[PDB]
Design an enzyme around this catalytic site. Structure first.
Site, PDB file in Angstrom:
ATOM      1  N   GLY A 285     -12.840   4.594  39.518  1.00 39.80           N
ATOM      2  CA  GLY A 285     -11.923   4.813  40.632  1.00 39.80           C
ATOM      3  C   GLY A 285     -10.721   5.723  40.403  1.00 39.80           C
ATOM      4  N   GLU A 322      -1.399   5.442  41.361  1.00 37.58           N
ATOM      5  CA  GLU A 322      -1.418   5.987  40.007  1.00 37.58           C
ATOM      6  C   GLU A 322      -0.046   6.520  39.581  1.00 37.58           C
ATOM      7  OE1 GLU A 322      -5.075   4.507  40.272  1.00 37.58           O
ATOM      8  OE2 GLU A 322      -3.882   4.900  38.538  1.00 37.58           O
ATOM      9  N   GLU A 344      -0.468  -4.053  37.604  1.00 40.87           N
ATOM     10  CA  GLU A 344      -1.346  -3.639  38.694  1.00 40.87           C
ATOM     11  C   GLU A 344      -0.857  -4.175  40.053  1.00 40.87           C
ATOM     12  OE1 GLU A 344      -3.929  -1.130  36.417  1.00 40.87           O
ATOM     13  OE2 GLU A 344      -3.283  -1.310  38.462  1.00 40.87           O
TER      14      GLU A 344
HETATM   15  C1  LIG Z   1     -10.306   0.464  35.063  1.00 45.67           C
HETATM   16  C2  LIG Z   1      -9.127   1.453  35.293  1.00 45.67           C
HETATM   17  C3  LIG Z   1      -9.551   2.800  35.859  1.00 45.67           C
HETATM   18  C4  LIG Z   1      -8.205   0.756  36.278  1.00 45.67           C
HETATM   19  C5  LIG Z   1      -6.972   1.464  36.784  1.00 45.67           C
HETATM   20  N1  LIG Z   1      -5.771   1.060  36.023  1.00 45.67           N
HETATM   21  C6  LIG Z   1      -6.868   1.109  38.298  1.00 45.67           C
HETATM   22  O1  LIG Z   1      -6.486  -0.019  38.579  1.00 45.67           O
HETATM   23  O2  LIG Z   1      -7.173   1.964  39.185  1.00 45.67           O
HETATM   24 ZN   LIG Z   2      -3.064   0.491  38.748  1.00 44.47          ZN
END
Ligand SMILES: CC(C)C[C@H](N)C(=O)O
Ligand SMILES: [Zn+2]
Ligand SMILES: *[C@@H]1O[C@H](CO)[C@@H](O[C@@H]2O[C@H](CO)[C@@H](O[C@@H]3O[C@H](CO)[C@@H](O)[C@H](O)[C@H]3NC(C)=O)[C@H](O)[C@H]2NC(C)=O)[C@H](O)[C@H]1NC(C)=O
Ligand SMILES: *[C@@H]1O[C@H](CO)[C@@H](O[C@@H]2O[C@H](CO)[C@@H](O[C@@H]3O[C@H](CO)[C@@H](O)[C@H](O)[C@H]3NC(C)=O)[C@H](O)[C@H]2NC(C)=O)[C@H](O)[C@H]1NC(C)=O
Ligand SMILES: *[C@@H]1O[C@H](CO)[C@@H](O[C@@H]2O[C@H](CO)[C@@H](O[C@@H]3O[C@H](CO)[C@@H](O)[C@H](O)[C@H]3NC(C)=O)[C@H](O)[C@H]2NC(C)=O)[C@H](O)[C@H]1NC(C)=O
Ligand SMILES: *[C@@H]1O[C@H](CO)[C@@H](O[C@@H]2O[C@H](CO)[C@@H](O)[C@H](O)[C@H]2NC(C)=O)[C@H](O)[C@H]1NC(C)=O
Ligand SMILES: *[C@@H]1O[C@H](CO)[C@@H](O[C@@H]2O[C@H](CO)[C@@H](O)[C@H](O)[C@H]2NC(C)=O)[C@H](O)[C@H]1NC(C)=O
Ligand SMILES: *[C@@H]1O[C@H](CO)[C@@H](O[C@@H]2O[C@H](CO)[C@@H](O)[C@H](O)[C@H]2NC(C)=O)[C@H](O)[C@H]1NC(C)=O
Ligand SMILES: *[C@@H]1O[C@H](CO)[C@@H](O[C@@H]2O[C@H](CO)[C@@H](O)[C@H](O)[C@H]2NC(C)=O)[C@H](O)[C@H]1NC(C)=O
Ligand SMILES: *[C@@H]1O[C@H](CO)[C@@H](O[C@@H]2O[C@H](CO)[C@@H](O)[C@H](O)[C@H]2NC(C)=O)[C@H](O)[C@H]1NC(C)=O
Ligand SMILES: *[C@@H]1O[C@H](CO)[C@@H](O[C@@H]2O[C@H](CO)[C@@H](O)[C@H](O)[C@H]2NC(C)=O)[C@H](O)[C@H]1NC(C)=O
Ligand SMILES: *[C@@H]1O[C@H](CO)[C@@H](O)[C@H](O)[C@H]1NC(C)=O
Ligand SMILES: *[C@@H]1O[C@H](CO)[C@@H](O)[C@H](O)[C@H]1NC(C)=O
Length: 902
Positions: A285, A322, A344
């Site tokens: 993603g 991001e 997150e």
């Molecule tokens: C598995 C990673 C690409 C996750 C990333 N930190 C997101 O939550 O988009």
């Molecule tokens: Zn993230």
């Protein structure tokens, strides 16, 4: 004692200072067809406590170092012990260096290695990604370290708190571009051994975590802008993507978002540049690698000609997500993965803030409610949920770390942090957040550190008063799972909380420190006028006149659903709200208009209101223009559709929905000037999309005619698609539904020659909307053929057929008969047997159908089920629930719809 190399967590005897790392991908296969990369690394580290062993992470690396697997030197004039032996311990993913004597505290050491690994197409570590440009298969080299895969690219102390600086060099073909976290030092120079290769050195990273490293070798190109403070912004993508202008939207928003965050966080963006790169098929993603963020293409690129408003929304919010990490997560990093939710959850929240800066007319902030709050409440209202917080000592293995990346962590995390910002006020939240970011820059934290810095900000002022410390309050929402339903008897103003479950019969077995009592921030509106704020303390019951009504008055709790809870009332209060929505719905904030629908359908499920009360709450929709309340309705009813669309109930249902939606359809017919122009802002566009879908799928002749006219028009001029991308999935589906092989064949034609994913997806799904058995069966026989249908699309397509009421028995029979094909595409892709079983069986709601799934299961002999082995179980159990739900609900619902559909 056990040996430290058999433990999952690193010793703390040795801490890294800095790494040199040189990587060389070989993008041509060595002709037995293996792609490799080569590497050399030096790590400088400091000894904290004497030890005669060096334990460092390594995963799937072969060592070619001269001598032992490493060479060990003292820094400055430090002596160094001799190596006894070096070994690899696979289980805990370590390279282990046994020494003949001890390292000394205060002393620094340098440890060099040479190594290689597979450059696999596995989206892990340093890996390869293959894609087509015209005739040619292209191959690039790229990274994904998150969470525990940095060690797969080079040996390192691969834990987030063990931060260091990194000096990266790429050795690559001399006509390819090399990117990493930091800008290149200078021009690339040719490799002396073979000048077909060049050497690109990158500037030293700041002190940072291993999981945030990135480096990429490709023939990608970029669009660029220099923000005024000189921060270079680039969007990178495939040459043809760039040439078609697909990077422009991302470029437009990136600068404003970065700017918003630096002011939001009160902290300068910590790097000289920001690259963002669109990767084909990046299944993970997006990843927030510091200075080089990776996206899947349809998360970063936007095509104005073909892409829809919802695509546009996805791009701006994902970028904002991001980018938020560049301070929160990257500059200040959580000490351990048990606190992932913070990181997150924080991005999942402020993504709305950043995006709203970039698109201030769109009211994007609202979307957290349907998008995260009600989404995660579906799973958090289950006995099987879990707390945001997990003890650190329970998260040890890479698999355990991975399990942290779920609904609860992202969406509940976003929900509770939004709750917290709201009861603190945002200005106060910002101050504590700024204080936290400055105190811990280039370091690591726990959630206790954020609580503390928020407390400081609370303590430094006099306006906002709390019923307890930030920590005491947030403990209710982070250490126990789930959330309360708050119930108000407005005749008395009594107000209670209980732990909310959708299943009224569930046994919760997970114990709570707090007996599932929360400290709850409660906002309330009375007769459309904001009331003073209230806190429910940690008690089952309380009373306040804030919640006492007269007879012709109403009260409504949780304005804008800022609080992570659901609300129930006595029946009288419900009716007044209902009549209010009848007579002037504008008195009640749109978000709460949606809340009323979301909560009551959940409460009905939990047996706390009758389902008819929930349906009554849909009655006002006939005069509702706005997206969200309609969305609440459509989301809550789709299960009623699943359950009833083969039953006597359905006719009354469709007729009811036709009634409710026709005026919305008429409204947009006028507004959109006969559909030639789209509404202005995002929300109204979302509403138009839903209204058209709902009208068409329910059989409103006016929508049926639109869809036929438009698809007819397109067929008479295939190069000029008359259908705005917002309406495409509906119009396609409806028009194919009405038509025969003329319509179906043309669309199949268009699937095969479409160059864009979003558009292929829509065609694939509309093709499943046919009402001819023979067309759905012929289509089924295509799904397996990879010439006609990609494998990664095969089960998805079978589910779209299953979704069609006529395609249900077709799909179901097809899956049964070609199940013998676990032993062909458990060998050729993962496949997701689990998602197929779910989709094709989700309508099951009769004993007879439960007999059929039980009778299916007894091919237990051989074949088996792979990924969906427990997905079948969940199917047999979900069917039991549906049978129970349909018997309890069929009659009452039939007659409610009969009654309310003119
Ligand atoms: C598995 C990673 C690409 C996750 C990333 N930190 C997101 O939550 O988009
Ligand atoms: Zn993230
Ligand atoms: C990690 O990588 C760093 C960058 O390659 C290493 O630091 C570099 O060491 C180079 C040589 O070892 C130096 O380059 C030149 O060497 C000549 C000898 O011919 C010297 O006269 C000069 O000092 C130097 N030339 C110039 C034009 O400066 C670099 O000075 C140096 N680069 C820097 C410091 O940025 C690290 O040593 C390496 N780490 C380890 C542990 O090996
Ligand atoms: C890291 O080292 C590993 C161990 O040396 C390498 O794994 C070996 O790769 C060989 C192919 O590259 C495997 O195939 C065997 O040998 C030849 C292929 O050249 C075949 O004819 C044999 O049929 C085959 N043997 C078997 C049992 O299939 C070896 O299987 C394999 N050895 C082991 C122990 O796994 C890695 O390739 C190497 N990786 C890198 C990236 O350098
Ligand atoms: C990145 O931001 C750019 C500047 O804000 C946007 O550029 C605008 O694109 C609009 C969409 O095509 C253009 O507006 C309309 O173009 C049509 C085409 O002929 C005309 O009918 C309309 O009258 C016209 N509207 C206006 C207000 O001119 C603009 O030409 C253009 N604006 C500028 C300043 O260049 C980009 O679209 C945006 N990129 C993306 C992908 O969103
Ligand atoms: C990575 O590169 C940086 C700078 O180019 C190196 O930092 C230097 O470290 C040396 C030795 O500790 C010091 O003399 C200099 O003061 C540092 N320079 C700067 C600008 O900080 C760093 O050592 C390199 N890492 C490794 C492992 O060699
Ligand atoms: C970089 O150089 C390589 C090698 O010359 C080019 O790759 C070749 O591209 C042709 C078509 O243009 C293919 O048919 C060859 O098979 C390719 N060779 C290999 C080994 O992959 C490549 O096109 C050049 N790239 C750029 C951006 O200039
Ligand atoms: C971070 O916030 C601080 C404190 O609010 C900012 O400093 C203020 O800047 C405004 C802008 O003119 C002044 O009017 C205030 O008097 C300043 N306060 C103090 C204590 O200096 C600071 O500039 C912000 N920094 C960043 C990097 O955004
Ligand atoms: C993880 O973060 C903590 C702080 O949250 C780091 O400890 C700080 O270290 C700096 C520099 O050594 C000192 O200025 C502070 O006094 C320390 N605060 C403490 C110890 O509470 C710690 O070094 C980080 N851990 C690692 C492995 O880097
Ligand atoms: C509202 O709350 C109060 C509790 O504080 C309830 O009143 C009490 O109910 C018990 C039940 O037997 C009585 O014995 C007490 O004498 C009552 N206390 C009073 C009147 O101060 C009341 O029933 C609640 N009303 C509801 C739930 O509608
Ligand atoms: C509830 O949410 C609505 C948005 O759905 C908020 O209304 C926005 O408020 C800001 C500032 O007050 C305005 O700049 C926006 O343009 C408003 N949008 C709309 C569509 O009205 C509302 O303020 C929230 N209510 C409360 C009490 O927090
Ligand atoms: C819950 O426990 C009760 C008795 O305490 C029992 O009747 C019921 O079967 C159990 N489980 C579920 C899922 O209802
Ligand atoms: C509906 O209520 C809104 C907000 O209170 C008000 O501005 C409007 O005049 C009202 N209209 C009617 C017809 O009651």
């Amino acid at each position: 004692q056990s040996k430290p190399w058999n433990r999952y967590r690193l010793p703390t005897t040795l801490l890294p200072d800095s790494y040199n790392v040189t990587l060389r991908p070989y993008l041509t296969p060595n002709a037995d067809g293996l792609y490799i990369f080569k590497g050399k690394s030096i790590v400088r580290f400091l000894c904290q406590e004497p030890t005669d062993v060096i334990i460092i992470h390594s995963k799937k690396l072969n060592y070619t170092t001269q001598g032992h697997m490493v060479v060990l030197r003292g820094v400055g004039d430090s002596q160094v012990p001799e190596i006894d032996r070096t070994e690899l311990v696979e289980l805990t993913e370590y390279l282990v260096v046994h020494l003949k004597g001890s390292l000394q505290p205060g002393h620094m050491y340098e440890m060099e290695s040479e190594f290689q690994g597979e450059l696999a197409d596995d989206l892990a570590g340093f890996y390869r990604s293959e894609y087509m440009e015209g005739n040619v298969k292209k191959v690039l080299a790229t990274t994904q370290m998150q969470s525990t895969d940095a060690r797969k690219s080079f040996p390192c102390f691969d834990e987030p708190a063990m931060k260091a600086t990194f000096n990266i060099t790429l050795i690559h073909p001399n006509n390819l571009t090399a990117l990493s976290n930091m800008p290149p030092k200078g021009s690339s120079t040719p490799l002396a051994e073979d000048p077909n290769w060049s050497v690109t050195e990158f500037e030293t990273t700041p002190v940072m975590s291993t999981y945030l490293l990135a480096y990429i070798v490709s023939e990608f190109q970029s669009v660029n802008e220099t923000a005024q403070n000189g921060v270079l912004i680039r969007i990178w993508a495939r040459p043809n993507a760039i040439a078609e202008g697909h990077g422009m939207y991302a470029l437009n928003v990136t600068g404003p978002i970065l700017n918003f965050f630096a002011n939001h966080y009160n902290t300068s963006y910590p790097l000289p540049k920001s690259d963002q790169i669109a990767l084909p098929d990046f299944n993970a993603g997006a990843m927030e690698n510091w200075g080089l963020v990776t996206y899947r293409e349809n998360a970063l690129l936007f095509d104005p000609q073909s892409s829809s408003i919802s695509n546009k929304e996805r791009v701006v919010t994902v970028i904002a997500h991001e980018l938020a990490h560049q301070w929160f997560g990257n500059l200040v990093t959580l000490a351990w993965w048990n606190d992932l939710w913070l990181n997150e959850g924080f991005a999942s929240y402020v993504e709305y803030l950043g995006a709203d800066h970039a698109e201030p007319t769109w009211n994007l902030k609202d979307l957290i409610v349907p998008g995260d709050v009600y989404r995660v409440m579906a799973v958090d209202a289950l006995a099987s949920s879990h707390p945001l917080t997990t003890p650190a000592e329970e998260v040890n293995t890479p698999a355990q770390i991975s399990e942290m990346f779920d609904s609860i962590s992202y969406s509940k995390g976003a929900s509770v942090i939004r709750m917290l910002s709201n009861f603190l006020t945002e200005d106060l939240f910002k101050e504590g957040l700024a204080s936290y970011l400055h105190a811990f820059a280039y370091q690591n934290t726990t959630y206790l550190d954020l609580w503390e810095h928020l407390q400081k900000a609370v303590d430094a002022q006099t306006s906002i008063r709390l019923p307890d410390t930030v920590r005491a309050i947030m403990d209710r929402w982070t250490l126990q799972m789930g959330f309360p339903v708050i119930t108000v008897d407005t005749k008395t103003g009594n107000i209670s909380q209980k732990h909310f479950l959708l299943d009224s019969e569930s046994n919760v077995t997970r114990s709570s420190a707090f007996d599932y009592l929360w400290i709850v921030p409660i906002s309330s509106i009375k007769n459309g006028v904001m009331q003073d704020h209230y806190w429910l303390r940690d008690v089952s019951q309380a009373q306040n006149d804030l919640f006492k009504t007269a007879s012709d008055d109403w009260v409504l709790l949780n304005v804008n659903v800022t609080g992570y809870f659901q609300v129930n009332y006595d029946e009288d209060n419900w009716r007044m709200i209902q009549h209010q929505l009848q007579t002037n719905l504008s008195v009640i904030p749109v978000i709460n208009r949606a809340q009323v629908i979301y909560d009551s359908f959940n409460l009905a499920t939990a047996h706390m209101v009758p389902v008819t009360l929930a349906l009554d709450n849909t009655l006002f929709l006939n005069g509702e223009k706005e997206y969200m309340p309609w969305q609440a309705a459509l989301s809550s009813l789709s299960y009623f559709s699943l359950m009833f669309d083969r039953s006597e109930v359905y006719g009354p249902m469709k007729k009811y929905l036709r009634k409710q939606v026709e005026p919305l359809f008429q409204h947009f017919e006028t507004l959109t000037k006969n559909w030639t122009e789209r509404p202005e802002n995002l929300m109204d566009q979302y509403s138009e999309i839903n209204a058209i879908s709902t009208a068409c799928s329910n059989g409103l002749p006016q929508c049926e005619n639109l869809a036929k006219t438009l698809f007819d028009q397109w067929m008479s001029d295939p190069e000029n698609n008359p259908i705005h991308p917002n309406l495409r999935s509906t119009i396609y589906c409806n028009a194919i539904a009405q038509g025969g092989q003329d319509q179906w064949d043309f669309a199949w034609g268009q699937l095969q020659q479409a160059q864009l994913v979003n558009e292929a997806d829509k065609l694939r799904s509309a093709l499943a909307c046919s009402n001819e058995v023979w067309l759905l069966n012929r289509y089924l026989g295509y799904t397996l053929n990879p010439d006609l249908i990609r494998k990664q699309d095969a089960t998805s397509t079978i589910n779209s057929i299953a979704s069609n009421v006529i395609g249900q028995p077709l799909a179901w029979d097809f899956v049964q008969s070609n199940w013998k094909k676990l032993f062909q595409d458990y060998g050729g892709g993962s496949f997701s047997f689990s998602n197929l079983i779910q989709g094709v069986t989700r309508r099951f709601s009769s004993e007879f159908e439960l007999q059929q799934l039980e009778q299916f299961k007894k091919n237990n002999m051989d074949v088996g089920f792979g990924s969906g082995t427990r997905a079948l179980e969940q199917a047999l159990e979900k069917t039991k629930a549906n049978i129970k739900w349909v018997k309890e609900n069929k009659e009452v619902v039939l007659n409610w719809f009969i009654e309310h559909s003119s």
